[PDB]
From a paper:
The RNA genome sizes of LSV1 and LSV2 are ~5.6 kb, encoding three major genes: the Orf1 with the unclear function, RdRP responsible for viral RNA replication, and the capsid protein (CP) for the host recognition and viral capsid assembly. CP forms the capsid shell that protects genomes and is responsible for both host specificity and receptor binding to transport the viral genome into infected host cells, or for intracellular trafficking. We determine cryo-EM structures of T = 4 and T = 3 capsids of virus-like particles (VLPs) of [name] virus (LSV) 2 and delta-[name] LSV1, belonging to tetraviruses, at resolutions of 2.3–2.6 Å in various pH environments. Analyses of these capsid structures reveal the intermolecular interactions that drive subunits assembly into homo-trimeric capsomeres and eventually into a complete viral capsid in which specific domains, such as the N-terminal domain, the helical domain, and the β-barrel domain/C-arm, could encapsidate nucleic acids.
To investigate the positions of sequence variations in the context of the VLP, we truncated the extra N-terminal 48 residues of LSV1 CP, namely delta-[name] LSV1 CP, which self-assembled in vitro into delta-[name] LSV1 VLP, for cryo-EM structural analysis to inspect the structural differences at the regions of low sequence homology. We reconstructed the density maps of the T = 4 and T = 3 delta-[name] LSV1 VLPs at 4.8 and 3.5 Å resolution, respectively, by gold-standard (0.143) FSC. We could only determine the structure of the T = 3 delta-[name] LSV1 VLP because the densities of several large side chains were apparent and the rotamers could be properly modeled. The cryo-EM structure of the T = 3 delta-[name] LSV1 VLP comprises residues 96−558 of subunits A, B, and C, in which residues 49–95 of NTD with N-ARM and the last residues 559–565 of CTD are disordered. The helical domain of T = 3 delta-[name] LSV1 CP comprises a three-helix fold as found in LSV2 CP, but is equipped with an additional N-terminal distal helix (α1’, residues 96–104) that associates with the core (α1, α11, and α12) of the helical domain. Delta-[name] LSV1 CP interacts with ssRNA via the rigid helix α1’, α1’–α1 loop, β-barrel domain, and C-arm. In addition, the focused refinement reconstruction in T = 3 delta-[name] LSV1 VLP further shows a visualization of the RNA coordination, in which a two-based single-strand RNA (ssRNA) was partially resolved. K545 and R556 are two basic residues on the C-arm, but only the side chain of R556 faces the ssRNA-binding site, as does that of R370. This ssRNA-binding site is formed by the dynamic C-arm and the βF–βG loop of the central β-barrel domain.
Author numbering:
A (entry chain B), B (entry chain C), C (entry chain A): 96 to 558
Amino acid sequence: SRITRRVVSNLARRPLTITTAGLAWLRQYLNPMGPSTSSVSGFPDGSAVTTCIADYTNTFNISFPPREAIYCTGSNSDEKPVMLDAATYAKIDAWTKSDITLCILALPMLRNVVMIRLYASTPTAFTLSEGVPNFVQRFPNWSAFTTEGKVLNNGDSPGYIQSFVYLPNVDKHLSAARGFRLLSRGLTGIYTAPSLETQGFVTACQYLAEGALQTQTVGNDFVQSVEVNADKTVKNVNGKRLHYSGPPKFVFPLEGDNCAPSSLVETYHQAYQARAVDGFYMPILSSSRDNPFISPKPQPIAVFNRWYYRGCLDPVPASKVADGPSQYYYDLNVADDVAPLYNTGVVWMEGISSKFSLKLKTRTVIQYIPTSGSVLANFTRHEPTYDQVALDAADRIRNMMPHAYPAAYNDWGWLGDLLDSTLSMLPGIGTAYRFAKPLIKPAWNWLGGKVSDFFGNPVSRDG
Amino acid sequence: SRITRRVVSNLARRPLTITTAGLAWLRQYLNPMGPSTSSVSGFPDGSAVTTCIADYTNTFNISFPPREAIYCTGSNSDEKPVMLDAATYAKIDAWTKSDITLCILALPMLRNVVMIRLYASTPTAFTLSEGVPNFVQRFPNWSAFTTEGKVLNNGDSPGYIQSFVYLPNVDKHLSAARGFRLLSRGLTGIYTAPSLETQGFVTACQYLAEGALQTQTVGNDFVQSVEVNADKTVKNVNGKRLHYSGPPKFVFPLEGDNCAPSSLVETYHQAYQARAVDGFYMPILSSSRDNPFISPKPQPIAVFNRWYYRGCLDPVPASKVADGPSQYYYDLNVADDVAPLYNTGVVWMEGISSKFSLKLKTRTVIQYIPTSGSVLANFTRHEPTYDQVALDAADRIRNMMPHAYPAAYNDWGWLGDLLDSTLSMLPGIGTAYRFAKPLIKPAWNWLGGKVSDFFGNPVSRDG
Amino acid sequence: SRITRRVVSNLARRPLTITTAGLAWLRQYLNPMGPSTSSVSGFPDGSAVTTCIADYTNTFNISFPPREAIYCTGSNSDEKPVMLDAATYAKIDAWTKSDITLCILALPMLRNVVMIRLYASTPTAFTLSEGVPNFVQRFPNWSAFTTEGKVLNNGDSPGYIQSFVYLPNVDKHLSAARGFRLLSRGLTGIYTAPSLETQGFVTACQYLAEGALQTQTVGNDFVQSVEVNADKTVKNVNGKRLHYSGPPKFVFPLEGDNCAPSSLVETYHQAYQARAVDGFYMPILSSSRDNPFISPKPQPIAVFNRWYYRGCLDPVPASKVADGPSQYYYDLNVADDVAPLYNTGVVWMEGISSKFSLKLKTRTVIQYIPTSGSVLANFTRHEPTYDQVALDAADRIRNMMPHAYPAAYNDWGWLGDLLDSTLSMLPGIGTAYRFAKPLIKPAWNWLGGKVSDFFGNPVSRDG
């Protein structure tokens, strides 16, 4: 479409607009895994500090794991991880006859980029275990769970298996940086199954789940003061119930009943959905205007679900105010330098073939402030830039972008001018005199039929 | 004043300005209980998510409660609320001979919209009980307290009674929503007393009291490790003093000595004051630019007052650093999904007649993100809008608006053009070419005499 | 340079720009200790509330303290501070033969403005004591420490001495104000040593260290429930290990290994460095756009350093998740109404003569909201102003300003027009038509050689 702006470039001019660096950052942020892999650029805020920008590209081959890749998470595996017993693994192998459901939940955690789950059938809700599990395994090692969300011992009935995805280089770099900020993140799953078995539906959506450091009320009723005279007068023990704060932890609000595929596809406008063979490609979008540096702060991660006891909502006695609304936090038994303000993503793939293979790539771009004497200090860069109209454009476009795209759609045609279209009535400029394009309502029918982009031009998808 | 903008509309034009939706939201936000009751509109941020907007209008008839509406809050009422004894109620009835003082404190709590208090005479400070009270009653049930801020048993001397105002529909809806945000809130009290008894002075003011989730240091000195040999050697008990964190709670900073009517009317410019018969109407204004969604998070509410022990401010030994500045948090014995960033309001009415009647209405507009399967899902709406110049105008006008108005003044004449006047030198537009009005310093003498609005036009108040 | 804007004032005009009040605030904020001492102005946000602005100017004569000014911090000084023994003080006096290192760390604390340290030689890292020290002294009283970061008893080997700098008037005023906000802060050290002994290098830098209220996980293993029958059956004691939250405290993230002079001068662009005799002058810059009021909230201050135990990062058993990453918070044994969003400053002076004298002045400007009945109420002021283009300029200029200046450089020539230069392409105005100056890259070679300002004009430094 070169002739378009070849011929319309002589009708209007351009006031103060984005620089090339803010443009480069915005195109590595909206489309992290497109053509922007050639170069990386930092957050345009003029930090005026020595920073080093590191990108991590990782690939994994998710498949139905063999027996040796599974691990019990119950009591029988508390000093070391334990193989899944052959008798127990027979129940897992029973899932091979039918189809399965793959769940990929990407919290804004850096070391553990995503969390993978395999259900025999689509679950009603995204459950969790009450008790903290034992030795949460990382890919390619999995960790089974019971039919309901409880830890599993050998011989119990398994309902789903789980495995995080750990990036060791991110850990090594984060151990040696004063601060960091997640510049961009992108997931991409290319699904492929043996030919003539192509069933399955993929639905992907991202939403802000702003966790924070909180503590859980705990009551234990421990003894307080006992008096003795060398074992002759132990009459008073003075034990009493005490409510205190458990160890602090970073809690993520994500509600169990609402992570089902139907709830997400029906609640969120931009929740992408398509046939499984189309794959998926999710760029994770931030949820805030700014992006301050965070010093590396690792603490255990927990997830909040709906409370159980009404407690203080109704009038209650004085003694039981401490209990209040009994709200329970589930452990993930992992710790990470969580970076909030980024949307939590979630992808469901139901009906996929049992012996599928999901070829998953991930690109994560992080900006560090190195500690001198570390390796990060040898790759530093000191031409920081400031361009806040790019930040305003990022604030603009976050709502209008769809939540995911087909895997093959890693190439766009409407970046360099869509920013101009925003510039047109960007309120920062009273009249930008922009001739790029008038905005058109898009209709992305990714499942089938015609697909309309932001400007009504059909996409050339075929094979 | 139609002819004004009939004749001045031909001298200048208008650049990018507010839409109709941002206008509708701003007029339901500045004046929640005016003519904007016809329709409701959401926060203009382009959330692009399924939301449902619910408005709650409630009316209550505050009066001097009879005997059966009072309840002891001390130890004698710890398994169930207890009637106020007739002997104790005689002291309360003694307040009937003279005038009284009504205090209405509206924290940014959603379920418990306001908290009501009745003093025999204007208190020096807004006190609270040290110990958490028993069965904090809701309207129309009250809960007495001693002369000073201590819980009351039958036979003690009462100083003031208290009753929250609970909205059950808000509780039902909040139990079934992923997130929420308080769009607007407005209180209105129409005072009326028997004719020829019209004395009383009302002073109303709102101010940001930004509470947060904090914990209180608690020391208990509980035993740690005792060794025995079947009751022959209990020589060591090893008890020691330990300082830990109490259960987490949402603390509101509002200082006791500074809630007196004189302090508020003398400290705050816009603190409205008038004769009691004029009634009052307080729109609660937000204190922040944005308004993010909050997942329903109920925790007990506490209030902070001035600390007592200097502690670590002066040089202190190592062992007593944990105590530090002894700062005590008072319970309200209530839990609510508190929504910060909204100003805490407070209204005092001193000298009002004993058998007055305060007809109080409240309008609260909240935007939910429904959980599918709940009732909220059946009333949803998916035309979200974005208009950030309206948000900039809201940021502009917050300082200039007065804190309250007379009850009868629910109709304005300067909304549609005051926003234009802001637009004139809104820095977003270099030259807006606006002809609405030049800003004029207002002087609101609501107690008596002439009252000047934002443009010098007198208000037509008479009877 | 009057002729410059005498002759270039006839070529262009000026749209909406800063007022005189926003200008006055910005010049008391960027250069707190320049000519702006004539008058003080508040934060330009239109708070519309009674405020009183108080400035504190303090002077101190830091020198090598005599014996009576030192105090042990170990166990032998836990009921009262103890003189440093003559035998122990001999080791300190041994530092007189050689040069020394002075460290000045200014956290955004109000009562304790700075913290002073004296090392016999430049330390590898800015360490701290594991155990909380006893009676942290204030100037002119110091408090010794061991060679490594441990508290010192008489007879131990001393490594460095420490003394805070306490402002009592700030404490008195903060005890009687509803809220406050640090308008500006500036340090200035004029070093002077006997003539012919002028060696030493000063390096100064400031950086945001955003502390917050957090708690530390503590495990103690205290007994829970023991049953007896008057000392005949004590068979079960039921003690167990419990992890809870320690007392809440305000934690500052500042990493020990990275406060060395080389790390700061090599990591930060604007980290000022010069010969010691040149002195230093650090204006502390805020790190945020806004500056909300904070109610006086004193709590103990702690500092975070790199964690030790990996903990939950690798797969771990269920029982030991509570421990997680063992991260230890160091006490400073002080409490203050910390005001975050202000950069933590730090100045190192190595090689300075043993019997030097550092004449240190400090100017701190704070805006209070008085509590009526306090002294602050008698000096109040009610002409608040709003000028947000000044705030945008403050946001602009924060990155470009150097972190410190020579002590004698308390006079500038590029304030009134540099703001205009920002105005030129301030995106708020599409075309500001400003003729002040085109921006030029500065090169501050304060150690020696020519120094280039923001416009290339050399500074007239001589003697």
